[PDB]
Amino acid sequence: YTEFAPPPTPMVDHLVASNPFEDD
Amino acid sequence: YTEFAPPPTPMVDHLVASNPFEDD
Amino acid sequence: SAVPSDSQAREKLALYVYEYLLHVGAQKSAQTFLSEIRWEKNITLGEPPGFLHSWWCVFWDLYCAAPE
Amino acid sequence: AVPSDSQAREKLALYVYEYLLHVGAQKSAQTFLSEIRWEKNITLGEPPGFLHSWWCVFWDLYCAAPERRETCEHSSEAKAFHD
Amino acid sequence: SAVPSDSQAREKLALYVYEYLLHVGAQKSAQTFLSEIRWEKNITLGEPPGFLHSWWCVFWDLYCAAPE
Amino acid sequence: AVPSDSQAREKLALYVYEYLLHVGAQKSAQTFLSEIRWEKNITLGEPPGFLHSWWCVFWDLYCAAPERRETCEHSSEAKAFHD
Amino acid sequence: NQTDYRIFELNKRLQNWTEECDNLWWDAFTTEFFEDDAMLTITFCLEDGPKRYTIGRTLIPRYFRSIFEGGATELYYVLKHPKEAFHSNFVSLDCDQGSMVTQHGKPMFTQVCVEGRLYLEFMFDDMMRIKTWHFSIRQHRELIPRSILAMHAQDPQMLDQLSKNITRCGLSNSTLNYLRLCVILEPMQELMSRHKTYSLSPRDCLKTCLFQKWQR
Amino acid sequence: NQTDYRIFELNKRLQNWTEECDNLWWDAFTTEFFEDDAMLTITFCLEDGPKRYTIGRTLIPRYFRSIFEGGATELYYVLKHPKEAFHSNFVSLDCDQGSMVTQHGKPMFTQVCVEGRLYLEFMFDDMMRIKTWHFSIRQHRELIPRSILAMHAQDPQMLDQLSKNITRCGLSNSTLNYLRLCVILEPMQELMSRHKTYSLSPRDCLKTCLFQKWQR
């Protein structure tokens, strides 16, 4: 637990590790 | 009617003017 | 003559001359040819121009190029 | 030099006219001259004419080809010209 | 900090580090990472290797080439 | 000169280890070192480490892109760096 | 005779490509044909309006590599009737009917032919290397082996997947994603220079690079 | 650097082709790239066993033209990793992975890619012209635009016509018919020489050319 610990994702919806440039 | 007048084609079957090399 | 491919050779020449006449635009010559030679009018053509023209292009290329 | 397509086309035209004459198709022969609007003068050779003579020895060599010898009647001098 | 893209930036980094760990063959590190960060295990991957590797290849090419 | 793929791969490896440490994931951090069989020595930088710092200003510039300005919260210095 | 042959030489070295060509190989390929300050530009119209992408020399190796990452196993350019123009210091090549050709591999080997205007500027010296590369894509085609049509012939679900294109304007996803990423990362290189010279955090590097910008 | 560029120059002049190119154009094309006694050979395996066809210089223009008569609107050769060999008097080029590429036109534009070994011998002089051309075809592919698959997509009778090849070993009927005709006509040229010099009927010309044959 060190200051820059990651946010929670309160977004429970299934997260996708997709390219942040790819078109939808 | 002059010596080299063409033969009759007694072959009545439908004649085809196809290339004499084309494969069948 | 007495060579045994001759009647077929001459059958074929007539066949191809007729195809040539039709593909060259000599409609009446073609029709006239058939009746002048006692041939029932039921010949089906190849694609234009027919074999006589194709054969001639190769033949005349060689004939012109043939040396003394 | 090398013939143009039109030179070749017209030479074939002339020799087909000659062919039609020597073959007993004088009606077709002059109809043809008109349908193609031939105007220059024509003098022709002994029967059967250039086309008929060359076609026929071409067709002989065709039939005397090794792969057509059987099932295609041919002359023997054509056969041996190959060999 | 106080920059307003930061929490998402850090959401995404974590997401891509996890994808990187899985595609690099660090199966347990990936599983451990998820539970060390309080993340429910329901992430679907891109194709190997994921974005972090692709992003890094371009970044490090530029970083090495960047002059004084 | 220009980095090789393996040099780049290993540099990313190191910085992800650092990232895992500074992010509170010490368990993952050493598991990772073992799963990839890292042996050379590591000394690391101040938190949050090289990767975290560069990723975050990269992500800012991404969000401050003209085509993403609206519908993506971003900083203003990133916005103006474009302009 | 000079510029025309250079593209043939470029096509020729691309025939040496294998799956194991890497950072060093693509950098060696790029140093042979491009200047150290070469610029490369790709233009097309996917959706919305026109897109334009421009990258500098250190980003050019991975551009070409991205074409192969995308599935291509072969790449060559056909230039139909290109216009040469000699100047005191460079030579231009301008080809309205340029074709970029790629052959994809297993499965269902597909060929992509991208048409556009290829405009090039070469340095007028011994190594006639490319200073600028500008390819404006008008349209692309995708070709299917007849064998692989007959393979999925009576299979309605596989045969309508064969009616879906595999690139968008000839760019496969690898290439498109790369060029877009390069918009953001490539001017960060100035930030990265700062970082390398003054010991300063990246966000402070950025802060300090807003400094030059508003100043002039 | 010498032989490689000659094929590029050959590809380049074929890009000038139009429907109005004729006897004189193809003869001018052939004089630029072939010797006056050049020989050209095509080899393949259609049916039965292997076929081999060899033609001399005056028959070579119409060989290339026959490819365009057959539907091709574009023709080029890709030589992957060809082997050069310099001799005192000629240069050989030997390419196991040669590709002959043709683009057909409307309708249903189809691309034919013929693979084989291309073996060439060039004269070692200024006009590095081809003395021998030998192409041994191993296989060919035929490519269909995806657009034209989608055009005849749900039309069962048009879509199985799209599974039928359009060439036989990459040779379309025009080319095949031409090479076969050339077997018979080309040695008749000796008969034709006789005819031109002695006034003798063609069949007597033939009779007299059996004379040399059995004599030696």
Author numbering:
A (entry chain D), B (entry chain D): 58 to 81
C (entry chain B), E (entry chain B): 10 to 77
D (entry chain A), F (entry chain A): 11 to 93
G (entry chain V), H (entry chain V): 65 to 280
From the publication, what sentences describe this entry?
The Wnt enhanceosome is responsible for transactivation of Wnt-responsive genes and a promising therapeutic target for treatment of numerous cancers with Adenomatous Polyposis Coli (APC) or β-catenin mutations. Here we show that B-cell lymphoma 9 protein (BCL9), Pygopus (Pygo), LIM domain-binding protein 1 (LDB1) and single-stranded DNA-binding protein (SSBP) form a stable core complex within the Wnt enhanceosome. Their mutual interactions rely on a highly conserved N-terminal asparagine proline phenylalanine (NPF) motif of Pygo, through which the BCL9-Pygo complex binds to the LDB-SSBP core complex. Pygo proteins contain three highly conserved domains: a nuclear localization signal (NLS), an N-terminal homology domain (also called N-box) including a highly conserved NPF motif and a C-terminal plant homology domain (PHD).
To provide a structural basis for the Pygo2-ChiLS interaction, we determined the crystal structure of the ternary complex assembled from human Pygo2(58–84), LDB1(56–285) and SSBP2(1–94) at 2.45 Å resolution. In our crystal lattice, there is one Pygo2 molecule and one LDB1-(SSBP2)2 complex in each asymmetric unit. Pygo2(58–84) adopts an unstructured loop, confirming secondary structure predictions. Its N-terminus is located on the surface of the SSBP2 dimer whereas its C-terminus protrudes into a pocket formed by the interface between LDB1 and SSBP2. The structure of the ChiLS core complex is almost identical to the previously reported structure of ChiLS30 (RMSD = 0.366 Å), indicating that the binding of Pygo2 to ChiLS does not alter its overall conformation. However, there was one marked conformational difference for a loop of SSBP2 (amino acids 49–51): a lysine residue within this loop (K50) shifted by about 6.6 Å, tilting away from the bound Pygo2, thereby avoiding a clash with Pygo2 M68 and L72. Pygo2(58–84) interacts with ChiLS through three sets of contacts. Firstly, F68, W69 and Y72 of one SSBP2 molecule and Y25, F60 and W64 of another, together with L245 and I248 of LDB1, form a deep hydrophobic pocket that interacts with NPF (residues 76–78) of Pygo2(58–84). Secondly, the PPP cluster (residues 63–65) and L72 of Pygo2(58–84) are accommodated by a hydrophobic groove formed largely by W48 and H62 of SSBP2. Thirdly, LDB1 R232 and R244 undergo tight hydrogen bonds with D80 within the NPF motif of Pygo2, and we also note salt bridges between Pygo2 E79 and LDB1 N237 and N241.
